[PDB]
Amino acid sequence: IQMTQSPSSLSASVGDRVTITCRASQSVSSAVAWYQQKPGKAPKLLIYSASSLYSGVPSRFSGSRSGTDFTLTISSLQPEDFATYYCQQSSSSLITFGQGTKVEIKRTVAAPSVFIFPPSDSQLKSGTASVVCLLNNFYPREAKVQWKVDNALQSGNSQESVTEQDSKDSTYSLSSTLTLSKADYEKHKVYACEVTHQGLSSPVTKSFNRGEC
Amino acid sequence: SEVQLVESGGGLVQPGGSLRLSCAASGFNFSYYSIHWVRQAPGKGLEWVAYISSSSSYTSYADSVKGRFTISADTSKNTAYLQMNSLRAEDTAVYYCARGYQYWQYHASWYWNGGLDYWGQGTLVTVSSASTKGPSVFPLAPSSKSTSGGTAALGCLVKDYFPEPVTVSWNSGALTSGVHTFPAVLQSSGLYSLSSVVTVPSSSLGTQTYICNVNHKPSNTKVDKKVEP
Amino acid sequence: QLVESGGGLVQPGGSLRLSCAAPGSRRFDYYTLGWFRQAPGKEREGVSCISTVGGITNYADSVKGRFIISRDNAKSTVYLQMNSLEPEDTAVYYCAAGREMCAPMMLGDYYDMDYWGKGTPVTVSS
Amino acid sequence: KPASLGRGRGAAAAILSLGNVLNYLDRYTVAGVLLDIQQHFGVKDRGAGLLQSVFICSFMVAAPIFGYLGDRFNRKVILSCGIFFWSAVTFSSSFIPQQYFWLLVLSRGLVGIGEASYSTIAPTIIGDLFTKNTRTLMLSVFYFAIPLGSGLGYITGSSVKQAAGDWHWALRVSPVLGMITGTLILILVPATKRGRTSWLRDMKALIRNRSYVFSSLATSAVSFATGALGMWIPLYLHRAQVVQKTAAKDSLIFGAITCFTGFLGVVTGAGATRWCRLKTQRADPLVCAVGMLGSAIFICLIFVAAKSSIVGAYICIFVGETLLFSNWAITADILMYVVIPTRRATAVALQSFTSHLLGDAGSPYLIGFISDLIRQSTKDSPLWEFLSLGYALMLCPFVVVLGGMFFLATALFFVSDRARAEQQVNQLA
Ligand SMILES: CCCCCCCCCCCCC/C=C\[C@@H](O)[C@@H](N)COP(=O)(O)O
Fold this sequence. Notes:
The structure holds four protein chains of four kinds.
Chain A: E1 4-6, E2 9-11, E3 18-23, E4 33-37, E5 44-48, E6 52-53, E7 61-66, E8 69-74, E9 84-89, E10 96-97, E11 102-104, E12 113-117, H1 121-125, E13 128-138, E14 144-149, E15 152-153, E16 158-162, E17 172-181, H2 182-186, E18 190-196, E19 204-209
Parallel strand pairs in A: 2-11
Antiparallel strand pairs in A: 1-3, 3-8, 4-5, 4-9, 5-6, 7-8, 9-10, 12-13, 13-17, 14-15, 14-18, 16-17, 18-19
Chain B: E1 4-8, E2 11-13, E3 18-26, E4 34-40, E5 46-53, E6 69-74, E7 79-85, E8 93-99, H1 104-107, E9 123-127, E10 136-137, E11 151-161, E12 167-170, E13 179-181, E14 185-186, E15 192-201, E16 210-216, E17 221-227
Parallel strand pairs in B: 2-9
Antiparallel strand pairs in B: 1-3, 3-7, 4-5, 4-8, 6-7, 8-9, 10-11, 11-15, 12-16, 13-15, 14-15, 16-17
Chain C: E1 3-5, E2 9-10, E3 16-21, E4 35-38, E5 45-50, E6 57-59, E7 68-72, E8 77-82, E9 91-98, E10 113-116, E11 120-124
Parallel strand pairs in C: 2-11
Antiparallel strand pairs in C: 1-3, 3-8, 4-5, 4-9, 5-6, 7-8, 9-10, 9-11
Membrane topology (chain D): Multi-pass membrane protein
Catalytic activity (chain D): sphing-4-enine 1-phosphate(in) = sphing-4-enine 1-phosphate(out); sphinganine 1-phosphate(in) = sphinganine 1-phosphate(out)
Protein name (chain D): Sphingosine-1-phosphate transporter SPNS2
């Protein structure tokens, strides 16, 4: 048993109309219930039996059936309706949940700002070298960063993390960290951080030379 | 009578051990309903685990935990228990409990689907072989590399600690604007590491020094490190 | 136990007819009637009942004039006829068998029924 | 308020159950040493039957008054006062001089007066501390102390008499534990809250209910037979075994037997009525009538076997008790089936009174009177004492058969009474 939702994320402005879809793999055909979760809280039941509203839920929500696909509808996207939504279904003696769909705020595009940080000397004293490339105040979330060492591409030795959507500007930020041993760092001279984003006309590369000041 | 469910029994467990949870409920007639268990991995979706109807004769598990878990109920005290054996690294998640209808296998069909109405709050379970450690700090020195548009970027690194959380502040709570603190990352060694940065005007560094304050209660270590060009 | 039957998906303004039957040769003359219902976010409540010997019916306050219960002792069956259904009638409906006399203010108490059924879902569309 | 109930309800239930055991342990201590009482005071079968008749009459008269005072005053005070009331008197009555038989009768009356208060008031407390779901279980735990205390009476009396060597010591043991329970109830039992009206309409309505009247008369017959046999069996067995020149183990065995027949009969009756209710709606009176008419035959065979073998008498006693004690949890259902909810509080309180008036108030005295009347007309010897008591004890199967006939007459009007009750209830509201 597995339901696939569509899409995995979407953005809309206040006053817009939003729909979510769950497509069923096996035979239930009208028994789907929908839930809502906010970051760090328990989920909440909204609609059962695929068209019936739970007790105390605002009436701007609705559901329906079409073929075998189950669709949810919100007619007035309020500031309180930015969360994650799931499907549930118990067609066998088992219960299965969907994968989720996150609704976020719609804004205007903006280019990131790229910063690169050489490893500190105190870091080298412990035998490890770490370099950080930083993207600040960009939109949308989708961006790619390429790591280059002496003009050679890297792979499989980095990690990334993204902040939640800004509470004022509704923008993001990115921090990528590349790790190398002390000997590996000393074996190379040039390091660079290449970034790809929709707001840039061409990739922007920042570079650094080991031992220079 | 308002319905309430509460979970307890979490904590840290070494790999291959065992642990027991409980979801005690009050405010309703316990013998007309069933109790479910749901868990959510860090940064992933919901997953259903087990089931027991109040008569302790109906029970079904999932394909991921068959033969390792066990659920039972105590109808006298309105409390259900879940026994977990041979935990792996994939069993790190928050565990909720919910309420059911007591006959959903029988009348969940073409057009009903019932529903899970009242939820608990959730308890956290962790599995790791790592030991408690103290966080070390390595600041990022501002320079022309991070200087752009009249402002420059500087920050501190919090590295090699366990377990989370760690709090970060600037000038003992005096500099709060322009600060972004990224979520923690679990390294291959089992120790966490995060970074916190801030943007300040370039001409400010000639006169103002910035210090980041690190607090880690489980290890009781506090470090005040100054950031200079 | 008793076995329910009937129930399905109905549009607003429709009607539907539920039934309970005893299994085997059991007769249930002593007393075995009364329909209850339960909703997804509320508690179990009584809907109607009828009397052993004379045929005296009692309904809850919110269903008066619409539902009609009847008893047939030659087949050991009880019927409920549901008219003019509304979106607030979505629930799971049960039969029960107890011993207290059929009277008002007796309906809502369900801790003293001797036999229960399993229920048949009724879904009113929109 | 469960906040104090978490300890109070458990402590109170346990201490009140032990109080009930002590309450029933002191009604049958005299039946165990009736032979020694007779031999010491020098009396005959007429005067040895007053020691239970006076008790039952006092209990009869004093129960409704305490049942009324129990909802105007503090209940713990009354329970504690009664405890010692029936205790101190029981202890003090063991020093009576040999010339003062009537003083023992007065003592038995006072003991009955105290036990009436205890056994009327304790159920209300134990039923006001619990909700709709667990009241029944706690009440059953309270009630399942009647056979145990009833057997412990015979066993304690006989054992203490045999061990000490003086029958007086049989009356000097239970006051010690009474004086402890009457203090523990003042500590462990939390305080429980208390609480022109006309009951002439209730009486005038209940008189015209045929099922109620016939069931009440059947219950009276059961009380008659139970009281007579329960007081007069062990002495008869001892006399019969003396006649055969093959002989106080009789009281021991009788207590052991009743301690089990008490549970067995109730379980059998409940199972049988649960099966029968799904075939016809006249199940309860028919089950009770069959039980009575099947217990009479096995009762009547004790008096035939006792002349030849004892083991047959014991087996007949076992079966007779088991069948006779199979209609004590059914008559309340017959009362609830045909009486509207507003007239039940009266309809119970009346019935109990009647059950004591036509039943076991005057039965042991009647048996003793008939025994002496038969005895005085013939030769005096142990053999004729045995035959006289045997012939006197033949009135019980007659009354049991009458009770069975009354239960059949109840089954005759059961359905019409139910229909009238339903019409009344639906007309009231
Ligand atoms: C065939 C031989 C028979 C042998 C019989 C042995 C003696 C057994 C006597 C058992 C008497 C038990 C009476 C039962 C209940 C009453 O005590 C209470 N209902 C009085 O409570 P109230 O009404 O005051 O609340």
